[PDB]
Symmetry: C6
């Protein structure tokens, strides 16, 4: 899918934060969006067609794949990218506000820094909430054999995944870049409070 409407919105705010926000937007663009667009999404091209179970009961493959993957990793990461960008847009809702009021002055320690720090803490608690949800549901490593225990299958079946290693490497990689994007917010908030 295209990423063009949010591109002009993230482009419109570029010279109102410090260097940390600029390199945070840089690692958001390069290491998250581009890497998902080229290599990451193509790896999950066949998640269901290459799935295979060792049985003959009809429909056991569907329910066992549904139990094994309640949601794919790539759509989870897409929702994570969406939910951590929109805290910054209200910052623009400050700017096009106050310039207009300066425009009103053209005719005839404020809330800016407060809106800034509340937006930053919102995006950080969103980041840590998504990391906690992923820790609770999936873990951080896919084995190559799953054991399925669902109706209408008989007693216990075992199903073999598709590429359990190439997914593991990218899971670890997205974990590391999310941790660095977590730490940078801590650095910037400490810098602003030190300049506070």
């Amino acid at each position: 899918g295209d990423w063009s409407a949010l591109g002009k919105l993230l482009d419109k705010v570029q010279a109102y934060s410090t260097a940390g926000g600029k390199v945070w937007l840089s690692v958001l663009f390069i290491f998250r969006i581009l890497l998902l667009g080229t290599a990451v999404e193509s790896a999950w091209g066949d998640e269901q067609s290459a799935f295979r179970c060792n049985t003959q009961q009809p429909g056991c493959e569907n329910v066992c794949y549904d139990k094994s993957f309640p949601i794919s990793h790539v759509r989870f990461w897409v929702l994570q990218i969406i939910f951590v960008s929109v805290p910054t847009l209200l910052y623009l809702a400050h700017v096009f506000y106050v310039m207009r009021k300066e425009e009103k002055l053209n005719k005839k320690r404020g809330g800016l820094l407060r809106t800034y720090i509340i937006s930053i803490l919102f995006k950080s608690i969103f980041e840590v909430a998504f990391l906690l949800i992923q820790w609770y549901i999936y873990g951080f490593s896919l084995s190559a054999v799953y054991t399925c225990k669902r109706d209408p299958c008989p007693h216990q079946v075992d199903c073999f995944l598709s590429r359990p290693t190439e997914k593991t490497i990218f899971i670890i990689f997205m974990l590391v870049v999310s941790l660095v994007s977590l730490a940078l917010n801590i650095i910037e908030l400490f810098y602003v409070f030190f300049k506070g």
Copy 2:
């Protein structure tokens, strides 16, 4: 499919409403169009190929899938996006009218607010009508086993769906964002009547 012709039309009206209409257009662009373009549409890539029924009678799969899904959710949401945007375009039909009449004045509590509020109530009754149609037809949760009762199949068959959980999460998500877009119109109409 591309979304470019309506993009310039929704871009052409941006500074004639309040902040509520602006953030309504924001959640229309981001949470509806982009999310449908990237992650939502790819989930329904195999609705029929991964469908499977437990029988041998030829053609029972076609009629049972037709009965189970009279219309897909993604095309329903596309029609919902189309039908709730066109009430605003007549607002532009006011503006390019009256500026031309001001242009005519260049040569030689009116109907604006009324057209505004009638357009807003039209888009809200369209929204609630589509929510009621979806409540009546589908419900809000897909089970993993369907029971089919149609000719030319024999007595009763049962067919297993494809990903009954990953669709359920996005159904709930589109429900929530439609409810918020419903409530925002109420907020803006009360604000205009309070300033009325």
Copy 3:
């Protein structure tokens, strides 16, 4: 396929007709082109692969599908979109004519309204001709079981379609929007004759 060469041609004439021609071009862009581009075309993605007949004679599926669908609905609608736009282009052939003659005057109840009304009646008779052809060939509702009576199959076979309801809804929808685009030409011609 792309729609870009005719886009600049339909964009080049925008301020030489009344409001009826403008909203006619609006419903031409939104409700015909965009809806075909996003949702309508994807529904007919598998017209032949999901087709299925109840026999063993080799090649009966090909001839029975050929008899059932002499031409698909989506390509018929594409030809209908093409044939009803080109009557307006000759209007541009007037304008870039006469401005050049006004350009010639820069150096050293006419045929405009007549060309206008002949173009409008041509596009309306094209519209009603295509509606009559579709009424004669297909009807307006697809059943879910077809009976095929062609060589080299044996006596009579029956073949099951693919999604007979989701196609029916869009057939009815294109019928309604074609009827409204038919009525608007009547409104505009009566308005011009009343101002005649």
Copy 4:
């Protein structure tokens, strides 16, 4: 495939011919390029996968399809579009020549009309040559049953095509528009000789 490099070249010459060349370029853009881009090419999406022969000898399908279709119609039409556009480009090779010589004059019944008419007769003899090649090889109607007489198959086999009618309609349509583009060159050359 994209059509963008030749687009700027056909756009660069637009105001150096009469109205006949302009409407010839118009029917070249609309009725040839767009119709091939949207509807025509998608009809030949499965020419080989839907092909089917009534035998068991391995590889008979490949040689019988190769004998039945030495070249597809759509690539033939693509080559026809390419070969009839390049006679006009040398006209540009006149213009950017002589303006430069007029540029040289800025510093310190000719060959134009002759190059024009030789380019037009070249494009017309190319058009009639391609029509004659298509008449000689294919004819103008595809039957629904082919009889194949090639090694390594046994004595005689018969193979069933894919959509013999929807291809026939577009074959007839491309024939008609090629005939009109043939006649327009005759009209323009007679007009220039009458003004000669």
Copy 5:
């Protein structure tokens, strides 16, 4: 794949050579890039899926297809297009050099023609080297039956190709246009030496 980065580089040098280099770039754009982009690449869409061998030994199809096609023709032509364009870029490395030195003069029979002729002879020897490699490996005509003599297959097998004629026509066509692009360099070098 896209061709956009080298497009601006080939566009940036357009008015520093004679008419022969201009029409050479013209036949490079039209007859090589566009024809590969639209019709040529789609013909080789199924090179392996439509391949078929007459045996039951598992894996014989893979090794026999590997022996029959060490590299496909379309990727060979892509490498040929890449390797014969980069001799011209150093010409730009002259121009943006010397203009800068003229820029230096703004502040406070040379090597141009030599770099020109060395670039032209490099691109011609690259062209003839690629023609010789294609003559040595493949020949210029694909038969319709291949005989395979590789382990782990038994004694001798025979495999049937996919479309042996439609590939032959384009092989001959690319041969002819490569020969014309070979001859044009000879014409231009003789013209420069005659003006030398």
Copy 6:
């Protein structure tokens, strides 16, 4: 996937290095990005579907393909392209710094060369690290028969690859262009130290 966000970043720094950095960016654009975009990626279109093993045990194909390819070559090259470009961006972080400080001077042997050489040595050690990882894991030649020794398969199986030669040629080609991009950094650092 698209490559557009990093394109403007690599375009924004073009006139702050010597000719070696310019031709290094040239071979980065042409021989790495374009060649991956057109021909290289299409060769690995069917890495798993054309994979084939000589057994009947269910799921042995999945684990044997997973052991044979822990990560594909094309995604490895994508990560290599990403990791060797970002050392240069900090150079921009110098420039938009110091110009702003010159902008500050507008109102009222330094660290530039040091940041330059540290960025260049970082990108070279990244290049040699990726070459060493590829040497350690894969080698530089793919055989056509693999021997698999993993549970749940029985004792030893053998699996046949897909196109072992067309991949070998591009492996060797990427090796050569990576070696040249390695040597050019050595040339430029020696040139700067000689001018040091």
